[PDB]
Design a protein that fits this description.
This is Leader protein. With 71 residues, this protein is mostly loops. The chain has one domain. The protein is 13% helix and 0% strand. The longest helix is centred in the middle third of the chain and has 5 residues. The protein is elongated, with a radius of gyration of 15 Å. It starts with 22 loop residues before the first helix and ends with a helix. 0% of the residues are buried. Zinc ion binds next to helix 1.
């Protein structure tokens, strides 16, 4: 337990990536941008809402593990 206002949970529990408090910011795709590979598996959703057809990942439904796994 931490002395957090209104006993808010510290970790970023929102589905998109951020905290419950930071949930409106989750809608913004700024966080998603600046990442080397969209396809790389992280908490954030690989398919980007703004980029409809630009990504061209979902339409062909081709996932290459080797490409995303740089590490
Ligand atoms: Zn959110």
């Amino acid at each position: 337990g931490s002395t957090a206002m209104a006993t808010t949970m510290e970790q970023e529990i929102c589905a998109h990536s951020m905290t419950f408090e930071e949930c409106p910011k989750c809608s913004a795709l700024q966080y998603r941008n600046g990442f080397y590979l969209l396809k790389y598996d992280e908490e954030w959703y690989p398919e980007e809402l703004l980029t409809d057809g630009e990504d061209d990942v979902f339409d062909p439904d081709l996932d290459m593990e080797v490409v995303f796994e740089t590490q």
